[PDB]
Amino acid sequence: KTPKNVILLISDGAGLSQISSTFYFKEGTPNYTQFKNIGLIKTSSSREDVTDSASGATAFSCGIKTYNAAIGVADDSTAVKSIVEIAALNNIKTGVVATSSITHATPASFYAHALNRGLEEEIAMDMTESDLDFFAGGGLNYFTSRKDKKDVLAILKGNQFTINTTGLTDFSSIASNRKMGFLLADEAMPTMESGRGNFLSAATDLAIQFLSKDNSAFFIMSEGSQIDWGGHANNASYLISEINDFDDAIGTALAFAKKDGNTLVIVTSDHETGGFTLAAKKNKREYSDYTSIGPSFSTGGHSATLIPVFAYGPGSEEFIGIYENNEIFHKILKVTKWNQ
Amino acid sequence: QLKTPKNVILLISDGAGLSQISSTFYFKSGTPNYTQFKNIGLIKTSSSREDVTDSASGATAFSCGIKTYNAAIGVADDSTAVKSIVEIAALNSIKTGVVATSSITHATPASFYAHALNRGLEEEIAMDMTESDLDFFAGGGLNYFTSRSDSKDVLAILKGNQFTINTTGLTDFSSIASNRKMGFLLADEAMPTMEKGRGNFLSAATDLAIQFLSKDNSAFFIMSEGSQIDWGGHANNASYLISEINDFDDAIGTALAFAKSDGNTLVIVTSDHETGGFTLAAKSNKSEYSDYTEIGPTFSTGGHSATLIPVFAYGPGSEEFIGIYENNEIFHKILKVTKWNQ
Numbered sequence A: 001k002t003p004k005n006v007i008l009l010i011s012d013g014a015g016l017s018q019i020s021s022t023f024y025f026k027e028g029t030p031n032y033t034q035f036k037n038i039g040l041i042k043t044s045s046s047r048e049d050v051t052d053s054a055s056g057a058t059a060f061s062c063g064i065k066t067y068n069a070a071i072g073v074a075d076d077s078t079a080v081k082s083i084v085e086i087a088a089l090n091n092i093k094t095g096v097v098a099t100s101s102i103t104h105a106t107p108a109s110f111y112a113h114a115l116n117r118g119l120e121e122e123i124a125m126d127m128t129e130s131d132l133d134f135f136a137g138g139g140l141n142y143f144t145s146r147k148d149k150k151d152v153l154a155i156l157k158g159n160q161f162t163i164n165t166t167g168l169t170d171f172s173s174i175a176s177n178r179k180m181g182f183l184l185a186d187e188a189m190p191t192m193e194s195g196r197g198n199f200l201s202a203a204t205d206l207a208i209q210f211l212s213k214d215n216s217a218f219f220i221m222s223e224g225s226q227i228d229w230g231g232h233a234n235n236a237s238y239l240i241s242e243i244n245d246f247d248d249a250i251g252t253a254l255a256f257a258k259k260d261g262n263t264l265v266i267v268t269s270d271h272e273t274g275g276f277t278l279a280a281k282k283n284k285r286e287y288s289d290y291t292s293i294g295p296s297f298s299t300g301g302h303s304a305t306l307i308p309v310f311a312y313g314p315g316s317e318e319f320i321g322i323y324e325n326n327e328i329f330h331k332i333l334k335v336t337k338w339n340q
Numbered sequence B: 001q002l003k004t005p006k007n008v009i010l011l012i013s014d015g016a017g018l019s020q021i022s023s024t025f026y027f028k029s030g031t032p033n034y035t036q037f038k039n040i041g042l043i044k045t046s047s048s049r050e051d052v053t054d055s056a057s058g059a060t061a062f063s064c065g066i067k068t069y070n071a072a073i074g075v076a077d078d079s080t081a082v083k084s085i086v087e088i089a090a091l092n093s094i095k096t097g098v099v100a101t102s103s104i105t106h107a108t109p110a111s112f113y114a115h116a117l118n119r120g121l122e123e124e125i126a127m128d129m130t131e132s133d134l135d136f137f138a139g140g141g142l143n144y145f146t147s148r149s150d151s152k153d154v155l156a157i158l159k160g161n162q163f164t165i166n167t168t169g170l171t172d173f174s175s176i177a178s179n180r181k182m183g184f185l186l187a188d189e190a191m192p193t194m195e196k197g198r199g200n201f202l203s204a205a206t207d208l209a210i211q212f213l214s215k216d217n218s219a220f221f222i223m224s225e226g227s228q229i230d231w232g233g234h235a236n237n238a239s240y241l242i243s244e245i246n247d248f249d250d251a252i253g254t255a256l257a258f259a260k261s262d263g264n265t266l267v268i269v270t271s272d273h274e275t276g277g278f279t280l281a282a283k284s285n286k287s288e289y290s291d292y293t294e295i296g297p298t299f300s301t302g303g304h305s306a307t308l309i310p311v312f313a314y315g316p317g318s319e320e321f322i323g324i325y326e327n328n329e330i331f332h333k334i335l336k337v338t339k340w341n342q
């Protein structure tokens, strides 16, 4: 009932309908079918019925409701301790993986504290002050082509990071590093449609092997970042290709957890985007053909639907039922007994 | 090794996806009864021939435990009749009831007492009621029993089978307690909408079924349907959809209040499919920008969609309903937990 390790996978912008696309548009059975314990979260922020990713992720990373655009700060704008900082005090190794820039609102709410999510140069500099042990994502520009002219990589190397800006490597290439960071694009990683391939699964496997090196317990947040961008663009093949990749990472996590026996895997989203619907195909006589799906959208923004939570591993029963998003944080602390 | 329920209440919200359910968290006074549920599953709703299901195949999945074609009522993909949960209940000495806010002959209620090649055959469906072992029903659809193209009087046949029938109003329990079976036909076609003054019919009817079917310490099975959530969806009419699902949520609280007091009753809440691509979008301010402080509901289709659908279960055996499975497994899971003879 007490997990040693926690992997949190966040599919940005995926409601149940986006999840459902994997049951129609992906070869084979989705890894979602492996879960038995399922819950539901209410995703409103402290001030807005519709959340953004910043307050959405800060509800998970810090266990409070805060205003849209906040990174790691409470509604009154004061810094709050995150699960990464708490994990560091409990001797837990930590890693953050994302297919957006590593400074984007979701990863950022795990290692920075900023008044507004668009302060991405401040966020990059904030990593220099975090106990983060591993990261992988885009966003090389935020560390090396800055308004202030500073070389943030040099500071990170001073803090014991090895940084790779060229490719994800084998685990044998990084096993002896103390901390490891990958910055593999200037801004966001490529889309799956532009050849990103299995970055998310590979990077999440690297984080697991790296952070568990010396029998240390770990916490990892891996984010399927571009699902939401698909929803905002009302671009169905973009959305579906990104969520199928995210379902591959879920299989990666779960294959490790099932063998390990001491790992809790939580999958959820921050909010839904686009009103994405698996509607019947539309024909011109305009009528429906229920034999076939034609994905449609109703909005270019986020929506307030409750969002599914999936949990596998010791303590996974704590995540069933219907609760506010910020209680994800408290439920993790409860089952791991990591102290605050 | 789960607990075994004596009784089962299956509540269907037709047309309600997770976004429809979520509307009760923003548009209902107080806290939704959905929040009482701990055990939660997901069903895949495709029919035997269609990725996007209709109510008939999707309800027949629940009542008979098979995938079948859109429009089938209690019949298999080859059009042969299949034994239903209500027919199994009767053979196990279980009292049965069906409630709906549509006509009682409409596809969801029909799939639990009738066997017909096509949901359009509502006069045959009303006739099938006379050969079923149903003990209790309430809904609309008086026209299918007394104003038929074949000028037969079906009501007379139902009374011939030990039904008492009321076409006036729902009564209290002591009003109907001595009757061996009870039917309420309270509208010619569909019951009124919530916006046109239906009021608390669905909870009252469900409560009444529960008292009636549990006379003399009898085990029971009830299907009650929030039928018009779907029609709000089809019309792309937010206040209609939302008032109808708020009323369904009230029905959930009625079922759950009984189950908690009883302690021997499994309550299952699900839907057959989603409809309308209903979305709790950010309100538009005016030339148009999104204001995330508040919600303005939007739709993307006039028809059903293929999203996976949430299942909620509470009571003995409810742990059977977690995880992800085909819609037709609802039937098999009900059978498995109740330990009824098949």
Ligand SMILES: C[As](C)(=O)[O-]
Binding pocket: A279, A280, A282, A286, A287, A288, B300, B301, B302, B303
């Ligand atoms: C516009 As349509 C045929 O999806 O209701």
Ligand SMILES: [Mg+2]
Binding pocket: A012, A053, A100, A104, A105, A106, A107, A223, A225, A228
């Ligand atoms: Mg994000």
Ligand SMILES: [Mg+2]
Binding pocket: A112, A113, A114, A122, A123, A126
């Ligand atoms: Mg800062």
Ligand SMILES: [Mg+2]
Binding pocket: A235, A236, A237, A238
């Ligand atoms: Mg495309």
Ligand SMILES: [Mg+2]
Binding pocket: B014, B055, B102, B106, B107, B108, B109, B225, B227, B230
């Ligand atoms: Mg119906």
Ligand SMILES: [Mg+2]
Binding pocket: B114, B115, B116, B124, B128
């Ligand atoms: Mg028949």
Ligand SMILES: [Mg+2]
Binding pocket: B237, B238, B239, B240
């Ligand atoms: Mg209206």
Ligand SMILES: [Zn+2]
Binding pocket: A012, A013, A052, A053, A054, A056, A228, A270, A271
């Ligand atoms: Zn987001």
Ligand SMILES: [Zn+2]
Binding pocket: A013, A053, A228, A229, A232, A273, A302
């Ligand atoms: Zn977004």
Ligand SMILES: [Zn+2]
Binding pocket: B014, B015, B054, B055, B056, B230, B272, B273
């Ligand atoms: Zn339906």
Ligand SMILES: [Zn+2]
Binding pocket: B015, B055, B230, B231, B234, B275, B304
């Ligand atoms: Zn419909």
